[PDB]
Design a binder for this molecule. Structure first.
Ligand SMILES: [Mg+2]
Ligand SMILES: [Mg+2]
Ligand SMILES: [Mg+2]
Ligand SMILES: [Mg+2]
Ligand SMILES: [Mg+2]
Ligand SMILES: [Mg+2]
Ligand SMILES: [Mg+2]
Ligand SMILES: [Mg+2]
Ligand SMILES: [Mg+2]
Ligand SMILES: [Mg+2]
Ligand SMILES: [Mg+2]
Ligand SMILES: [Mg+2]
Ligand SMILES: [Mg+2]
Ligand SMILES: [Mg+2]
Ligand SMILES: [Mg+2]
Ligand SMILES: [Mg+2]
Ligand SMILES: [Mg+2]
Ligand SMILES: [Mg+2]
Ligand SMILES: [Mg+2]
Ligand SMILES: [Mg+2]
Ligand SMILES: [Zn+2]
Lengths: 73, 111
RNA sequence: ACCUUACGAGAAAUCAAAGUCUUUGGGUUCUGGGGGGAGUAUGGUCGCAAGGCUGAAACUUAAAGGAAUUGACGGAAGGGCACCACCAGGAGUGGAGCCUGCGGCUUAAUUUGACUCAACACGGGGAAACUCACCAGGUCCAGACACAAUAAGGAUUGACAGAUUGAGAGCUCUUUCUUGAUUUUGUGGGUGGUGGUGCAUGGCCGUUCUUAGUUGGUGGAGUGAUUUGUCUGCUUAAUUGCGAUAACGAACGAGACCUUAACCUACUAAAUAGUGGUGCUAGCAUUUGCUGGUUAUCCACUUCUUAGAGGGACUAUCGGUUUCAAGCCGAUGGAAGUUUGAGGCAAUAACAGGUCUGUGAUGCCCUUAGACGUUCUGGGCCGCACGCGCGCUACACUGACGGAGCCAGCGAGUCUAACCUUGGCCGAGAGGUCUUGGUAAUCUUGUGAAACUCCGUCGUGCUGGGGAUAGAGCAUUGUAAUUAUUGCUCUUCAACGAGGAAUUCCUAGUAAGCGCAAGUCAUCAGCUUGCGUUGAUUACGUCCCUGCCCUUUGUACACACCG
């Protein structure tokens, strides 16, 4: 060997380990009524209306199926 | 180490071997390694006879200073073989003729 | 003075005195008491002088010395071997162009090991990616286990689109879903490394040396270390043996052994080997024949093919020559008469020989998450002013080209895969495509190989020798072929006219020519390991050169002359 200068530009950007968020499972809350659901789910063959949908800018995700389910209004 | 190596060569010759030979090679007490040879009896080295009568084996003992190789050569006795050649190739034995007295009188036995 | 004994002596070499000396006394004189300092200082005394004769110490040192032994070496003397030496020769190499390996130069990197024999077509090293170790970059953890911390009102994981990125790595970010105790953050403690050290090692390999060398028992010599055996000579491939003979008798290595090649009308047998017949046929003749084809014609056979068991050569017989012995040389017979040919195996003692990059063989040292781990993308190992070493093609009519003839042996080959490929068809070719046979004495395959042979064109012209270096296309392998992978066509058509000093290999189916198979292999042979085909000249010696071995000898050497 000759040397190790570690020449390359410094790009140490080891990521965020999905930062612990605050209280979750915000379906909706209803004063003396039954709660509807924000973040529409999915008409799948497996997912039994338990998985929500990300609300992005002009698309809706899945999370566990990583497939967009958006349809026109 | 010598206890074992003298012990094993004594055991093989007591078991009826024609010749035994053990080699220990490795670092003993110094960085400069050295081979010991421990022998008894006689052994042949060349020819087809070695394949049939010498059994050989090699081992690597893993000590804390390094690897100690252990060779063992055992010359079995050709007489106790019971399967194949009973003697070395150049062993010749002439059988002693049983010696009897000259007759010096012609006779006929009858029936 | 000499020769022989050894009564005796001695540490031995040696000695008729160096004997009559621990069993110690014939007479007498002189000198020595570890090595240096040192025959020096100083004082005498002799001398013209140069010097002679007497002659210390302080201090310093653990050996200095004698005679023999075994090695190593010698610019000492002899002997003996070997085409990795020469002789008489053959074919070359060194010149040329290319191929390949090494050094150098260059580079981001041109990864590295190995420098006389005993490095350099070597690492089975024919590297497009992988291999791969090097260079530029990007992921991952594949960081066991333990203890702490974090934390089910989430310890942590994954990602759609966009920016980004070589990239459909969410790698990172914007964005917000999903997962659920598996992980995450430290402390230890591990793990992995083609990272270092072969001069820390094992095993393996190479070399001395595949030369002929090595060792006990008992006896003899010597106080002993040691020596003889193990040798003057002859002989052999050979410490192979005859002979001499204080040695006899053996052991390892050589030889024997094992494999292979050559002989077997002797045995045992065979459509996976092969004849001959008899059926069935074809062609030609015609007499009573010639040559083929045929797998269900079947009957017999083993010469040739194959391998089991065996036989056979032992230099047999004769002649010649030699202590008339081991042998050697002719002739005859024989399949075979250089160890019948060729290998495999291969002693004691070695070497700082090579290998840590074959190994889940390894000690220690380093590294271990912006890794020296593993993976992915792209380069590099191939870069070219030069110096070397193995090779290939040639320099030409003992030839080039065209047509025709036309013959081997060693071998390899696919199934849960796609290897060896017959045959039909298309294409100038290289190739494509449809079927088939083969897990193999069955099929490829009589591997119809090349040199060669016969007829033709060339006609001494760098020429129809040579085909380097360039330009266009067509295909094949592969994820990919640009620094052209390889194959084919057309065109371009260079050096080279037998090669200086130097130098290599070789003694009969051998050298040399000529191809083929296998290994590496998806593709690629100018390489290697084997196999056949065609087949010479010269010698049957010697120590001249170069090496190695031995003897005698000298030695103040013994990590041994690099002392
Ligand atoms: Mg060793
Ligand atoms: Mg002396
Ligand atoms: Mg040349
Ligand atoms: Mg190489
Ligand atoms: Mg190389
Ligand atoms: Mg690397
Ligand atoms: Mg590692
Ligand atoms: Mg690595
Ligand atoms: Mg070593
Ligand atoms: Mg004796
Ligand atoms: Mg004695
Ligand atoms: Mg003796
Ligand atoms: Mg004669
Ligand atoms: Mg031509
Ligand atoms: Mg062939
Ligand atoms: Mg050109
Ligand atoms: Mg010469
Ligand atoms: Mg040739
Ligand atoms: Mg002298
Ligand atoms: Mg000395
Ligand atoms: Zn779903």
């Amino acid at each position: 060997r000759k040397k190790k200068v570690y020449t390359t530009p410094k790009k140490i950007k080891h990521k965020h380990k999905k930062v612990k968020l605050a209280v979750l499972s915000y379906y909706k809350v209803d004063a003396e009524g039954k709660v509807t659901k924000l973040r529409r789910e999915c008409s799948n063959p497996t997912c039994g209306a338990g998985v929500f949908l990300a609300n992005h800018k002009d698309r809706l995700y899945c999370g566990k199926c990583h497939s967009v389910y958006k349809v026109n209004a | 180490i010598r206890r074992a190596a003298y012990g094993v060569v004594r055991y093989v010759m007591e078991s009826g071997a024609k010749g035994c030979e053990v080699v220990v090679s490795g670092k003993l007490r110094a960085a400069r390694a050295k081979a010991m040879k421990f022998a008894d009896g006689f052994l042949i080295h060349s020819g087809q006879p070695v394949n049939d009568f010498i059994d050989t084996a090699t081992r690597h003992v893993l000590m804390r200073q390094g690897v100690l190789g252990i060779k063992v050569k055992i010359m079995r006795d050709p007489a106790k073989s019971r399967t194949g050649p009973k003697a070395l190739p150049d062993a010749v034995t002439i059988i002693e003729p049983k010696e009897e007295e000259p007759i010096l009188a012609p006779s006929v036995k009858d029936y």
